[PDB]
Symmetry: C2
Subunit: 431 residues, 2 copies
């Protein structure tokens, strides 16, 4: 009942906060900007001093904060990274491990992001959860801010929950987004700016792509949008629209701009009418500040947002994702869970469209991103692909034969490669 | 108003019935036993006479009926197979084509079985549909019998619907399973036994395997069982359970036996309480006869039955499917459809998806546990729940790549664990 008394009792230093984490246990943390830099530096220091060991850390969407501290290659023998998604940080480790006599240093845990809450809480189990939070409000609640995802579940299921208060973390309204002090085991404070998503340059091809994509977005569309230069530009094209909605996996600066412009009203959604729904947020300082106390933005846990069945309840969903390669069948590959939840959900939505877009080439036009056959596991299976788009147009693949697929996909390739690809298709018997 | 008058008006010969189908149009037909033999023979003949061309046929689960009629190789240029699953019949055509001068002769259409009704009705478009049906009842309705699937949907969407009345087709109750006479364009009669799935004999491993699986089936389970001896036999170890339910893609003999025995009450299901749900059926004459007018069996369309969200509604779902290979990561491969239930069972409260296979093939000489699947998979590794061989069961959910590989190598036959362990080390699955 005395919230200022509980806060003072629980408030401590980063060093002391992480000091009681058991060796040989399971720890998890928020995603990206949610990762708590002061707590993680102190924990990394505990390993450096040889005072903790055999600590498994299970997580998604790592940022420079985790990579610079606990995930640093030298602590790999004491803090074991159990990544459930592989980003730039793990790729760097993976390469280092290969060069060190094919040593294994990342313990990839295959999973569905939409199942993360259940996997972490039930099959795996998380003993300690750490997350950056907004400042306590006058009723005693902290907000997970940029993060909802699996965090709102694991913050509660973990045997200890440690928070890092940071005034740069927006106070976001959402389902289980708010956590009462009575539910927090320790508090440290570190007011420092949130980590930013790098702003990436627009290549020329995105212009034609954004216009091709934009023709495929109807009024009343309910947007889900990934990150990058391409989706931002698309958001740029949609500024003249009206009455759009948002139900997105990640909330990004392009989408927020449409909110700021009054383009997104959410009045045509079936679920969460009136509110922009997302499961975690990434962007730049201007966007992070804008989320603070916004009543028309509402974070929800990932097992809700990325449930394809939930997605489909909104009419006219448009899912826009990027990929690196598309093959002649055409399966798509985004590497070299998130996305796939929305491909399925958007197709299921009434009037819904799933769009996957890529420029037709890479490397100053020397490499085709339209290829004969993806190498190994794919991102988007060919049975799920709906609409693909390059600077040369768009194709809806649903119901097309293998031959019809190969022929139409080749026509989206750069002219320099159509002859080469046509030959490959006959050799593969796609014809 | 007068059904007897409408019937005689529409009744005709297979020849005349199919004589009007336009060249260059799209046709589809029921699955398996639903494939109308008289109508399809008559259609194949038009192609032989050279009286029809450029006809695309879109379908799933070919049966020797279509295999021996419209699908015969010599007609490939006139009746074009647009296959949405690839089974034994298409393999044979495809192999023959390669021998006929690297000629492309089968068109594969990638799809989700549970999207089949929409893909076919809306993306592809179907003009003529043909399906075997039970005899007209005294209210003027035929039944799709052993077929619902996408058949219920396309019978209505096609410009023309042609039925083959067969007294051997059971009269089955289900959603849209009954078709009024005013919804039918033409009728032919051909009373002949339905196609049977071959009965297959058990191999010894199924005995250990069935036990391991049985032990994973909780009180009041809601079953889906995959076609084949393995699932058929696990049904057998369940002769003793009580209050089981059925919500399955295919209704097979093993499941029907549990119904016959009173083991299945469906009283613990949340959806379709009291009724066994399936989307199409395959078995032998004894099972087909048993379905006739059964009030506790209810077919529903595949876009309902195979919707993972629907599957999950029922508590304690158990999905038992078989496969040919499991790799060390470990995805599964069923080829030389079911993914919906792998997803649905895991989502069910108390649900389990089980995929099982003997650990070896070729008299113990080939391991069915392999390092990495060659090409595209059936069940992806992020979706696999429980995998079973005669050496035990493992729940893969939440396991790391190392944890997956180590427990999986122990499910391989001992002759192979070392050879497999070394491959894993080389792949850095370690």
């Amino acid at each position: 009942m005395d919230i200022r008394a509980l806060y003072d009792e629980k408030l401590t230093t980063p060093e002391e906060a992480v000091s009681s984490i058991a060796s040989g246990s399971h720890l998890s943390m928020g995603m990206f900007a949610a990762e708590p830099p002061a707590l993680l530096k102190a924990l990394a220091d505990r390993a450096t001093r040889g005072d903790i060991g055999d600590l498994r850390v299970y997580y998604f969407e790592t940022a420079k904060i985790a990579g610079d501290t606990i995930l640093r290659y030298e602590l790999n023998n004491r803090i074991k990274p159990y990544s459930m998604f592989v980003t730039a940080v793990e790729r760097a480790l993976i390469r280092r491990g290969i060069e060190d006599g094919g040593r294994k240093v990342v313990n990839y845990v295959p999973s569905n992001f939409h199942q993360a809450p259940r996997l972490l809480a039930e099959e795996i189990g998380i003993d300690t959860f750490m997350h950056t939070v907004s400042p306590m409000d006058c009723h005693g609640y902290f907000s997970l801010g940029v993060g909802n995802d699996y965090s709102s579940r694991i913050a509660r299921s973990a045997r200890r929950f440690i928070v890092e208060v940071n005034r740069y973390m927006p106070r976001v309204q959402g389902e289980a987004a708010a956590i009462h002090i009575s539910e927090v085991d320790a508090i440290v404070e570190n007011h420092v700016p949130l980590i930013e998503m790098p702003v990436r340059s627009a290549i020329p091809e995105y212009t034609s792509i954004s216009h091709i994509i934009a023709d495929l977005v109807p009024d009343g569309a309910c947007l889900q949008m990934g990150v990058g230069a391409l989706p931002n530009l698309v958001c740029g094209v949609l500024k003249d629209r009206n009455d759009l909605g948002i139900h997105t996996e990640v909330l990004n600066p392009g989408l927020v701009d449409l909110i700021r412009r009054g383009v997104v009203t959410n009045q045509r959604k079936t679920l969460d009418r009136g509110r922009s729904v997302f499961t975690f947020a990434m962007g730049q300082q201007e966007m992070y500040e804008y989320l603070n106390d916004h009543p028309a933005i509402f974070s929800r846990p990932v097992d809700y947002v990325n449930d394809p069945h939930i997605i489909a309840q909104n009419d006219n969903v448009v899912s826009i994702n990027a990929t690196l390669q598309i093959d002649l069948t055409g399966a798509c590959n985004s590497e070299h869970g998130g996305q796939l939840d929305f491909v399925r959900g958007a197709y299921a939505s009434k009037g819904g469209r799933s769009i996957i877009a890529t420029p037709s080439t890479a490397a100053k036009g020397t490499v085709s991103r339209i290829i004969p056959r993806i190498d190994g596991p794919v991102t988007t299976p060919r049975i799920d692909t709906h609409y693909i788009v390059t600077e040369f147009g768009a194709v809806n693949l649903k119901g097309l034969s293998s031959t019809e697929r190969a022929l139409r996909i080749i026509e989206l390739a750069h002219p320099d490669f159509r002859d080469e690809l046509t030959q490959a298709a006959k050799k593969m018997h796609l014809i």
